[PDB]
Write a protein that binds this ligand. Structure first.
Ligand SMILES: CNc1nc(NC2CCN(Cc3ccc4c(cc(C#N)n4C[C@H](C)N4CCN(S(C)(=O)=O)CC4)c3C)CC2)c2cc(CC(F)(F)F)sc2n1
Length: 467
């Protein structure tokens, strides 16, 4: 190592002192990822993992943080001999990146629950020898910065992390695991995943972080959870203030999910004089459109969740239809199961519950109901259309009969006279991209929907029961 100028704000006695440290580091040529992650991990430990003795804020003394920092830089410098890996042209080699990955990996405890909270930071790595999946990727990047490897940067999809490096930053390397019961690909490129058009690799439209975005990542990685029913107000405030600092400096520009996180925090506890949650959700979508070809799913997911919490059925349906319009141009691959799970839960649990309450409210005489709005029926249809189109061409199927009962129920929440008002046009008006929905068209306006025919069309089931 730490330089004199990095040390002058210690001790950190409050949330605002932590914010000052982040501001000072963000003003430097390269913010120190190791320092910053150790500080966050330290305060998260004493605010969420063990609050014994807490009276206000866990003071972070320089002696304590500097000793943790020294434990990290000693391990890395001792285990990675840079002379074995000459930096050709002032950039890093694949072998060096895989060395650093191995040093982090091999340090980890032999057995632990990888799903646990509060194992994301370098504090966890040093004091518990535990990291979560993306935590390992972050740690590799922090280690490379500590070694002077300016070209190694964090790469992020919506469900995975790796690194970029090398000439023009054009190389990719896996540095951590993905999911459970997948085989390690550490050291390899991500090109096969890009080429197969999986969601996991975002068709190549993944985030390539600079150092400031790596700071944003560790701030998003703060976990305020104390338990299933309790969050640390202190950590919520810290994360919120840090995200506003990053926002003001321009470092959330290219980070859609961070904008959604900030919107969620503002919904919980609004900051006076700041943009409303909707504004922020829409900025997150705009970031995805601008920098990532509109190939990201979660910006719409964050927006839909806000509308669903506020029981705004219309706008929730629109955002989930928009969700589906992105997924339709992907192939559903091995290792995409997390996004399948989210679409499944929206289709088969969230939408049904939202429409069930809308039906009860309509019975009690609600006006302007989504259930009497043909544009809302069109959004529901567009949601299913995008899921059906996603499945086309995919190496693994999406739909099955366990989806069909919920489709029939949801369709039936709209009366036939509402459903009749949507005009399905071929290449309120809607065009279908999927063959499954094109063949379902003439079932969609009957007063009583033909449940059996819908199931056949959605699952492309060939036959009915013999007897
Ligand atoms: C912030 N930066 C960041 N975040 C990353 N991942 C986050 C992505 C969002 N999730 C929270 C989450 C989860 C599910 C969500 C939603 C929103 C919806 C909807 N609809 N849905 C669907 C589910 C079914 N429901 C619907 C109903 N709502 S409700 C009751 O509130 O109405 C609850 C959620 C959200 C916000 C948190 C984690 C990642 C991931 C990265 C990759 C890697 F590898 F690094 F980890 S980087 C990153 N950055």
């Amino acid at each position: 190592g730490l330089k004199a100028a990095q040390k002058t704000l210690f001790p950190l006695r409050s949330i605002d002192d932590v914010v000052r440290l982040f501001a000072a580091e963000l003003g430097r040529e390269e913010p120190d990822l190791v320092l910053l992650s150790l500080v966050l991990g330290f305060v998260e430990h004493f605010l969420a993992v063990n609050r014994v003795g807490l009276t206000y804020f866990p003071v972070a003394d320089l002696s304590i943080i500097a000793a943790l920092y020294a434990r990290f830089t000693a391990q890395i410098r001792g285990a990675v001999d840079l002379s074995l890996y000459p930096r050709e042209g002032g950039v890093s080699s694949r072998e060096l990146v895989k060395k650093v990955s191995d040093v982090i990996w091999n340090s980890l405890s032999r057995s632990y629950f990888k799903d646990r909270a509060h194992i994301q930071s370098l504090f966890s790595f040093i004091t518990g020898t535990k990291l979560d999946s993306s935590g390992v990727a972050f740690a590799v990047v922090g280690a490379c910065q500590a070694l002077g490897l300016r070209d190694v940067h964090l790469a992020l999809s919506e469900d995975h992390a790796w690194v970029v490096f090398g000439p023009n930053g054009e190389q990719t390397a896996e540095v951590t695991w993905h999911g459970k019961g997948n085989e390690d690909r550490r050291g390899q490129t991500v090109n096969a995943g890009v080429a197969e058009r999986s969601w996991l690799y975002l068709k190549g439209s993944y985030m390539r972080c600079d150092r400031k975005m790596e700071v944003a990542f560790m701030v998003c990685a703060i976990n305020p959870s104390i338990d299933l029913h309790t969050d640390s107000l202190e950590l919520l405030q810290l994360q919120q203030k840090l995200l506003w600092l990053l926002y003001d400096l321009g470092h959330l520009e290219r980070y859609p999910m961070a904008l959604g996180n900030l919107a969620d925090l503002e919904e919980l506890e609004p900051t006076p004089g700041r943009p409303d949650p909707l504004t922020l959700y829409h900025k997150g979508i705009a970031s995805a459109k601008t920098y990532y070809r509109d190939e990201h799913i979660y910006p719409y997911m964050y927006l839909a969740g806000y509308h669903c919490r506020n029981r705004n059925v219309r706008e929730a349906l629109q955002a989930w239809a928009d969700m589906a319009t992105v997924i339709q141009d992907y192939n559903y691959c091995r290792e995409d199961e997390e996004i399948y799970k989210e679409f499944f839960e929206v289709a088969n649990d969230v939408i049904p519950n939202l429409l069930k309450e809308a039906a009860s409210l309509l019975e009690a005489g609600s006006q302007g109901s989504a259930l009497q709005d043909p544009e809302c029926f069109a959004h529901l249809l567009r949601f299913y259309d995008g899921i059906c189109k996603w499945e086309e061409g995919s190496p693994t199927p999406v739909l099955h009969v366990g989806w069909a009962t919920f489709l029939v129920q949801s369709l039936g929440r709209f009366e036939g006279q509402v459903r009749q008002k949507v005009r399905i046009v071929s290449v309120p008006v809607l065009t279908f991209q999927s063959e499954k929905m094109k063949g379902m068209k003439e079932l969609l306006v009957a007063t009583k929907i033909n449940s059996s025919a819908i199931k056949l069309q959605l699952t492309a089931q060939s036959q009915v029961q013999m007897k």
